[PDB]
Design an enzyme around this catalytic site. Sequence first.
Site, PDB file in Angstrom:
ATOM      1  N   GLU A 199       7.477   7.915  14.422  1.00  0.00           N
ATOM      2  CA  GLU A 199       7.624   7.322  13.103  1.00  0.00           C
ATOM      3  C   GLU A 199       8.571   8.132  12.229  1.00  0.00           C
ATOM      4  O   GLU A 199       9.410   7.586  11.528  1.00  0.00           O
ATOM      5  CB  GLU A 199       6.256   7.228  12.426  1.00  0.00           C
ATOM      6  CG  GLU A 199       5.341   6.167  13.007  1.00  0.00           C
ATOM      7  CD  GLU A 199       5.675   4.746  12.540  1.00  0.00           C
ATOM      8  OE1 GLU A 199       6.694   4.536  11.823  1.00  0.00           O
ATOM      9  OE2 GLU A 199       4.901   3.827  12.891  1.00  0.00           O
ATOM     10  N   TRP A 258       0.890  -1.151   0.000  1.00  0.00           N
ATOM     11  CA  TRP A 258       0.000   0.000   0.000  1.00  0.00           C
ATOM     12  C   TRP A 258       0.939   1.213   0.000  1.00  0.00           C
ATOM     13  O   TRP A 258       2.130   1.092   0.308  1.00  0.00           O
ATOM     14  CB  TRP A 258      -0.874   0.015   1.267  1.00  0.00           C
ATOM     15  CG  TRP A 258      -0.127   0.028   2.599  1.00  0.00           C
ATOM     16  CD1 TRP A 258       0.195  -1.056   3.356  1.00  0.00           C
ATOM     17  CD2 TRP A 258       0.371   1.181   3.328  1.00  0.00           C
ATOM     18  NE1 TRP A 258       0.854  -0.665   4.498  1.00  0.00           N
ATOM     19  CE2 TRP A 258       0.978   0.701   4.506  1.00  0.00           C
ATOM     20  CE3 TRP A 258       0.364   2.572   3.087  1.00  0.00           C
ATOM     21  CZ2 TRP A 258       1.576   1.554   5.450  1.00  0.00           C
ATOM     22  CZ3 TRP A 258       0.961   3.417   4.033  1.00  0.00           C
ATOM     23  CH2 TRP A 258       1.557   2.901   5.194  1.00  0.00           C
ATOM     24  N   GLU A 307       8.559  -3.374  18.027  1.00  0.00           N
ATOM     25  CA  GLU A 307       7.600  -3.726  16.976  1.00  0.00           C
ATOM     26  C   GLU A 307       6.236  -4.113  17.550  1.00  0.00           C
ATOM     27  O   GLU A 307       5.190  -3.742  17.004  1.00  0.00           O
ATOM     28  CB  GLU A 307       8.123  -4.860  16.100  1.00  0.00           C
ATOM     29  CG  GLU A 307       9.260  -4.456  15.188  1.00  0.00           C
ATOM     30  CD  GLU A 307       8.835  -3.537  14.056  1.00  0.00           C
ATOM     31  OE1 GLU A 307       7.629  -3.231  13.917  1.00  0.00           O
ATOM     32  OE2 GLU A 307       9.718  -3.135  13.271  1.00  0.00           O
ATOM     33  N   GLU A 330       8.923   1.360   6.570  1.00  0.00           N
ATOM     34  CA  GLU A 330       8.635   2.263   7.682  1.00  0.00           C
ATOM     35  C   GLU A 330       8.435   3.725   7.271  1.00  0.00           C
ATOM     36  O   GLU A 330       7.720   4.488   7.937  1.00  0.00           O
ATOM     37  CB  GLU A 330       9.758   2.177   8.714  1.00  0.00           C
ATOM     38  CG  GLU A 330       9.848   0.850   9.433  1.00  0.00           C
ATOM     39  CD  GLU A 330       8.702   0.603  10.406  1.00  0.00           C
ATOM     40  OE1 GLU A 330       8.020   1.567  10.823  1.00  0.00           O
ATOM     41  OE2 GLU A 330       8.500  -0.572  10.777  1.00  0.00           O
ATOM     42  N   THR A 357       4.570  -0.818  19.001  1.00  0.00           N
ATOM     43  CA  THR A 357       3.929   0.009  17.977  1.00  0.00           C
ATOM     44  C   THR A 357       2.665  -0.654  17.450  1.00  0.00           C
ATOM     45  O   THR A 357       1.660   0.017  17.215  1.00  0.00           O
ATOM     46  CB  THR A 357       4.867   0.285  16.797  1.00  0.00           C
ATOM     47  OG1 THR A 357       5.165  -0.941  16.122  1.00  0.00           O
ATOM     48  CG2 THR A 357       6.151   0.909  17.290  1.00  0.00           C
ATOM     49  N   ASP A 383       1.648  -3.772   9.220  1.00  0.00           N
ATOM     50  CA  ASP A 383       3.059  -3.809   8.822  1.00  0.00           C
ATOM     51  C   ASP A 383       3.911  -4.131  10.041  1.00  0.00           C
ATOM     52  O   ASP A 383       4.878  -4.888   9.952  1.00  0.00           O
ATOM     53  CB  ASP A 383       3.517  -2.463   8.246  1.00  0.00           C
ATOM     54  CG  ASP A 383       2.993  -2.202   6.846  1.00  0.00           C
ATOM     55  OD1 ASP A 383       2.043  -2.885   6.402  1.00  0.00           O
ATOM     56  OD2 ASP A 383       3.535  -1.294   6.178  1.00  0.00           O
ATOM     57  N   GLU A 384       3.534  -3.567  11.183  1.00  0.00           N
ATOM     58  CA  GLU A 384       4.276  -3.786  12.417  1.00  0.00           C
ATOM     59  C   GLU A 384       4.308  -5.260  12.819  1.00  0.00           C
ATOM     60  O   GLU A 384       5.350  -5.767  13.228  1.00  0.00           O
ATOM     61  CB  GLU A 384       3.711  -2.929  13.560  1.00  0.00           C
ATOM     62  CG  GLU A 384       3.481  -1.452  13.240  1.00  0.00           C
ATOM     63  CD  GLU A 384       4.739  -0.689  12.837  1.00  0.00           C
ATOM     64  OE1 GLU A 384       5.537  -1.196  12.013  1.00  0.00           O
ATOM     65  OE2 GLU A 384       4.914   0.448  13.327  1.00  0.00           O
ATOM     66  N   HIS A 439       4.871   4.997   6.843  1.00  0.00           N
ATOM     67  CA  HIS A 439       4.125   5.193   8.095  1.00  0.00           C
ATOM     68  C   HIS A 439       4.093   6.650   8.535  1.00  0.00           C
ATOM     69  O   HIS A 439       3.048   7.170   8.959  1.00  0.00           O
ATOM     70  CB  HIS A 439       4.734   4.350   9.214  1.00  0.00           C
ATOM     71  CG  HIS A 439       4.649   2.876   8.979  1.00  0.00           C
ATOM     72  ND1 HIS A 439       4.938   1.972   9.971  1.00  0.00           N
ATOM     73  CD2 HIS A 439       4.339   2.204   7.843  1.00  0.00           C
ATOM     74  CE1 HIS A 439       4.806   0.782   9.423  1.00  0.00           C
ATOM     75  NE2 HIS A 439       4.446   0.869   8.139  1.00  0.00           N
ATOM     76  N   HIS A 459       6.835  -7.271  10.871  1.00  0.00           N
ATOM     77  CA  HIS A 459       8.178  -6.920  11.320  1.00  0.00           C
ATOM     78  C   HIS A 459       8.461  -7.653  12.619  1.00  0.00           C
ATOM     79  O   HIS A 459       9.569  -8.132  12.840  1.00  0.00           O
ATOM     80  CB  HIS A 459       8.308  -5.411  11.553  1.00  0.00           C
ATOM     81  CG  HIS A 459       8.155  -4.581  10.310  1.00  0.00           C
ATOM     82  ND1 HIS A 459       7.715  -3.279  10.374  1.00  0.00           N
ATOM     83  CD2 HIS A 459       8.395  -4.913   9.023  1.00  0.00           C
ATOM     84  CE1 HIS A 459       7.696  -2.855   9.125  1.00  0.00           C
ATOM     85  NE2 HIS A 459       8.102  -3.806   8.272  1.00  0.00           N
TER      86      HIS A 459
HETATM   87 FE   LIG Z   1       7.692  -1.794  12.193  1.00  0.00          FE
HETATM   88 FE   LIG Z   2       6.204   1.970  11.963  1.00  0.00          FE
END
Ligand SMILES: [Fe+2]
Ligand SMILES: [Fe+2]
Lengths: 345, 345
Positions: free
Chosen positions: B87, B44, B178, B125, B181, B210-211, B128, B214
């Site tokens: 971020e 995205w 991670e 990242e 967040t 996404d976090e 974000h 990770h």
């Molecule tokens: Fe992350």
């Molecule tokens: Fe992030």
Amino acid sequence: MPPREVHVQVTHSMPPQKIEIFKSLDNWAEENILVHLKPVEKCWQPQDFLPDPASDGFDEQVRELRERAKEIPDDYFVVLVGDMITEEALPTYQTMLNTLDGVRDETGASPTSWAIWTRAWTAEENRHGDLLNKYLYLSGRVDMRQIEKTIQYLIGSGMDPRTENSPYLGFIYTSFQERATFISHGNTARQAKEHGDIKLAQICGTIAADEKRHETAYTKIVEKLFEIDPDGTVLAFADMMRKKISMPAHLMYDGRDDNLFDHFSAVAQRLGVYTAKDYADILEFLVGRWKVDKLTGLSAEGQKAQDYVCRLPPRIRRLEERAQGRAKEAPTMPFSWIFDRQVKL
Amino acid sequence: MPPREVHVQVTHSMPPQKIEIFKSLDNWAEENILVHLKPVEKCWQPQDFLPDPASDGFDEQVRELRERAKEIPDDYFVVLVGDMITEEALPTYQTMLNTLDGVRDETGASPTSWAIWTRAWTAEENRHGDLLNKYLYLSGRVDMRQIEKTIQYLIGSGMDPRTENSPYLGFIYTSFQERATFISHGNTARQAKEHGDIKLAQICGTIAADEKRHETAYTKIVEKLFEIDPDGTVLAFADMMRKKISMPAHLMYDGRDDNLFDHFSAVAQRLGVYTAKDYADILEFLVGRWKVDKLTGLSAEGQKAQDYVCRLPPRIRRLEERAQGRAKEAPTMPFSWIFDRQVKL
Ligand SMILES: [Fe+2]
Ligand SMILES: [Fe+2]
Ligand SMILES: [Fe+2]
Ligand SMILES: [Fe+2]
């Protein structure tokens, strides 16, 4: 298929003992370099040049920004976008500084003058991408999704400036690049002013101004290097020239143009924002600024280097200013950054 | 007057020959870690969740975004802003990965699986901060100038996670952050939904997603390490807890609040976005995820460490329950991020 580097990874070509020179130049740095950093409270922020979302005049401000942007040709936008993408790849630039042996930040918060510069310099550069980012977004003239995709590729590709963890090579590189950006941003500013947009001119000019200070601080570091070791610093200056100064955003890819950087450069060249002549002009300036010409006590190798360095500028000027093929006979080509609209190369 | 660290700066605590372990793991990572990176073309982009400047519906889209934002209270915005600022400090985070001895990127484009991850993770990242930045800008609910000033300070201050160039410590740290967040972003996502804004909920949820990936990749690295160096991964996990996991934006300063991070934290805590209870919950999850209690064949101090690690979570929990004053008797306080309007702490 993001472009990859076509060279061999050379790391740490500088003598481990020379690191001492840099640890020794710590207080010198703190006095002659860190004074080129504008303190946060006296710095301009992106919001200073963008429509104010917390003002009753937000709407008309955004509407005006967009009307002026229609008067600005796609040619200009492709260059402006390329400049913005380069700025947004910042993490990579802080990384390249932190790869340099004597100056690197070992913890991410180190109290060394070199580390403080790295973090503070990065802090300042961050505003450049933010400002150009919000501007292009509001303009409605570009495809932010493709631009954002190009940014993700670029950061993921990173870059290898061929500095080999050497502060000698690294600071020659950065001094060059800073002047390069100062020129690009200064030219876009000048042109933006003629297309009738003074606010865009203020934007590019303010960014350029920051570039000059960074240039000033970096050239100083090299100036002290020619003092402590004229020979080795001349050799380094020469090494970079043979290698050639490769631009940081040269691995630029938008998912559909394999030669995105060359195509982007062609338009900048054509527009006069950053020509191949300027590469020579920056070289010429640096030679004369460091007075490479006026150096003595160099070995037969350092003498060869000094001569090579002093002779290169006029040489390149001849070689690169002769362009006739790309110049007038440049085909037209579509850029995804502008919804595949086409501009002459 | 930016907050500096109150700790001696220790480096390279990890025994140098252990660096060859990672050198070896280089192909295993290419097989089980690098698979957690979403390819650029299937990712995205910020534009996917923001008003489209190249559409006829731009104006109404922005207008709606601004109407909904009026329904969202200042308490929420203070947290949302703190999350965004964190971020945006991304350069610092890529640098902290590059300080790690075995997994650092020595060139800025090293072909190693570890470097590839560093660059690609950073690329991910970046989106974000961009997304949250453009959102807060359009909302008209916050002071972008002060927020931008806070970001410049933060990047300049950097941070020291107390990982001491150790991939053992580093990957424990990142695994923690991670999940931290993921929680914060997930909670703001949920609350945003309650205030009537599903688009803001999509935004925060997409970032949270996404976090998690990770987190998954990082825990795997510690997982594989728990196999190779059981004893060492026990001491490292314990060392970090001893020190305490310090948040990356803890040196937060807006030019006028010396305890900006604590004040920001107090509001997040009060809102339930990220409570002190979560700190323990994440530790408990990690202990159970890596099966620390099952690790047999542990040396003397390793036994001490394993026990300390296993008993800390419930201890913290109880030690974190007794908070009568902090949130209940909390005073009201102004935040420059919101033009000095005041929220309860
Ligand atoms: Fe992350
Ligand atoms: Fe992030
Ligand atoms: Fe810049
Ligand atoms: Fe610069």
